[PDB]
């Protein structure tokens, strides 16, 4: 029985209309055009033979407004005149002379570990694909990014408001990815320089495992549900010792509990048993715990609860 | 020998000139006035009897511009006219008809666990104290806040640019505090409602313990340094099993290693042994590891960088 769960992204059309190509000298990557501002990764300023130890302060100083070229390729093409430039953290903030007429209602936020967001992968300012990832507890994402993808954007949607949360910056040694929030900070402890970096230990996202067990129950699969319970406080002491994130309940999880009649504490107990082995059985076609679906994913896709 | 380390905050004058009082009905707290915007916690709109599960969307729809009173008390006082209101996550964005003429150069940023920032504690729109804190690994701070302190702001300073990183929201059950970034998200998993909340477990900030051990070496207190080394990788596996954050080196830490000639890996080994007990000895007057001073504190206050 198919769970009815897929990796679902937001429709990308509103964000496609904001993607541009940014070029600074011999370097090029993607930018995001909103109102009179274009955001892009600051390493567009760095000469390719200097990516290991750039002085971004001096690089910024060395630029003028004419150092940047911004092009919209898709839809109505445009070449945007830069009238101002500023650096914020790991991003450039370029001020352009024309406000994007396709600017959607938007906000900037930071995504938290375990939360899901949609990514619009772009090359040379052209959107090429979309996918959705969960921010891992070690502040990487398991994305799909090649050379030239920097400046690809990640976002969520609340109603018609797009919340931009990610600008792609780099690939780590283990093949995962990270980037910047739009306040310019890099997720995690990573730096935007081409050096090998300490990447931290990942964990199972316990709230998302709970959501997936609820998805299994909503599909008629409940062999792992026993009357036994583990309290949140006790589960969280156990989680610290067994590479799980600590569980924090939300209204979204509570809705799944009410709809199924299975208490959160029953699933916390189940996770502790299932972590020691599935005993030859499967849950939603898997023999391992799944933490890439959120409580909101489960509520929206199975129950239609936005 | 006194190390020369103290808890050092930025001078607060530039930020005090941005502080206002925000009142909505019978609720009052502090706000931050930058350009034509006043930021403040959204629970200023919530009646005191409804704080345990506010419908903030409905509260916001029910307000008008006239629901808010904004006053600047210190310096050149003013009662500001509110001409727009909006909500961004856990913060209200009030638009006022006058741009703050004392608006400093500023950015908004999020502070990371282990990093230090300065807090201007305010009551009724009036600055009353300043102190510095480190963001804990569980996204709380060990602050000093009483009723009426919400909207107090935390910040760092890079040159003449103020980087606002914190707006105060709540006290947790264990006496620590948390707040919002200026994107309106709460630090950590906390929600701005008056209910019991899961508090995640705190950890030692390994990078700051390393800085403090370098401060001891710079002060001549080096009895804990041995030839033995622990690699960053092996230390980080041990840290996961011992309530420490994983270590990530920075240029600030490297500067301390070059100055003392003691390798980071020698101090990682030391931390592992010291954590089991100081064997009756002291380091910089302490019998336990200290993680409230950053590599940058040590570079500035001891090496004068
Ligand atoms: C920007 O488009 C690009 C995205 C990555 C390219 C491959 N997949 C991506 O997600 N970002 C970068 O190339 C980074 C630039 C830095 C931040 C200034 N660097 C980066 O991701 O580095 C990855 C690894 C780390 C070790 C290393 O030498 N290296 C760089 C290789 C990988 C890419 C091909 C040749 C260079 C870039
Ligand atoms: C705003 O000025 C104020 C600041 C705090 C007042 C005391 N010191 C502060 O730092 N913030 C609030 O009053 C919060 C409003 C919420 C966000 C809507 N509430 C708050 O901080 O509540 C604190 C109390 C006392 C200590 C504590 O753990 N706690 C929360 C309650 C809720 C659960 C029941 C008992 C505890 C846990």
From Swiss-Prot, chain A:
Catalytic activity: TSAVLQ-|-SGFRK-NH2 and SGVTFQ-|-GKFKK the two peptides corresponding to the two self-cleavage sites of the SARS 3C-like proteinase are the two most reactive peptide substrates. The enzyme exhibits a strong preference for substrates containing Gln at P1 position and Leu at P2 position
Occurrences of domain Peptidase C30 (ranges): 3-306
Organism, as annotated: Middle East respiratory syndrome-related coronavirus (isolate United Kingdom/H123990006/2012) (MERS-CoV)
Described function: Cleaves the C-terminus of replicase polyprotein at 11 sites. Recognizes substrates containing the core sequence [ILMVF]-Q-|-[SGACN]. Also able to bind an ADP-ribose-1''-phosphate (ADRP).
Name of the protein in its database record: 3C-like proteinase nsp5
Parent-record interval covered: 3248 to 3551 of 4391
Active site: 43 (for 3cl-pro activity), 150 (for 3cl-pro activity)
Domain of life: Viruses
UniProtKB/Swiss-Prot annotation, chain B:
Reaction(s) the record says it catalyses: TSAVLQ-|-SGFRK-NH2 and SGVTFQ-|-GKFKK the two peptides corresponding to the two self-cleavage sites of the SARS 3C-like proteinase are the two most reactive peptide substrates. The enzyme exhibits a strong preference for substrates containing Gln at P1 position and Leu at P2 position
Domain (Peptidase C30) ranges: 3-305
Taxonomic superkingdom: Viruses
Active site: 43 (for 3cl-pro activity), 150 (for 3cl-pro activity)
Function comment: Cleaves the C-terminus of replicase polyprotein at 11 sites. Recognizes substrates containing the core sequence [ILMVF]-Q-|-[SGACN]. Also able to bind an ADP-ribose-1''-phosphate (ADRP).
Record protein name field: 3C-like proteinase nsp5
Species annotation: Middle East respiratory syndrome-related coronavirus (isolate United Kingdom/H123990006/2012) (MERS-CoV)
């Amino acid at each position: 029985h198919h769970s009815g769960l897929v990796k679902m992204s937001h429709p990308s059309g509103d964000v496609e209309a904001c993607m541009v190509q940014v070029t600074c000298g011999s370097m090029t990557l993607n930018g995001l055009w909103l109102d009179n501002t274009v955001w892009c990764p600051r390493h567009v300023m760095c000469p390719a033979d200097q990516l290991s130890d750039p002085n971004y302060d001096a690089l910024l100083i060395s630029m003028t407004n004419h150092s940047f070229s911004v092009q919209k390729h898709i839809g109505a093409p445009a070449n945007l005149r830069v009238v101002g430039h500023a650096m914020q953290g790991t991003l450039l903030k370029l001020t352009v002379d024309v406000a994007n007429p396709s600017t959607p209602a938007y906000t900037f936020t930071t995504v938290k570990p375990g939360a899901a967001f949609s990514v619009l992968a772009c090359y040379n300012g052209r959107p090429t694909g979309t996918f959705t990832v969960v921010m891992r507890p070690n502040y990487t994402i398991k994305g799909s990014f090649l050379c030239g993808s920097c400046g690809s954007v990640g976002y969520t949607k609340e109603g018609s408001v797009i919340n931009f949360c990610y600008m792609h910056q780099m690939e780590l040694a283990n093949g995962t990815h990270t980037g910047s929030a739009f306040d310019g900070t890099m997720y995690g402890a990573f730096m935007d320089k081409q050096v090998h970096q300490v990447q931290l230990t990942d964990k199972y996202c316990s709230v998302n495992v709970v959501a997936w067990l609820y998805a299994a129950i909503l599909n008629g699969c409940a062999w792992f549900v026993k009357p036994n319970r583990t309290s949140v406080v006790s589960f969280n002491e156990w989680a610290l010792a067994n590479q799980f994130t600590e569980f924090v309940g939300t209204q979204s999880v509570d809705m799944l509990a009410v709809k199924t009649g299975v208490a959160i504490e029953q699933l916390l107990y189940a996770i502790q048993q299932l972590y020691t082995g599935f005993q030859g059985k499967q849950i939603l076609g898997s023999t391992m715990l799944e933490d890439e679906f959120t409580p909101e994913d489960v509520n929206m896709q199975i129950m239609g609860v936005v």
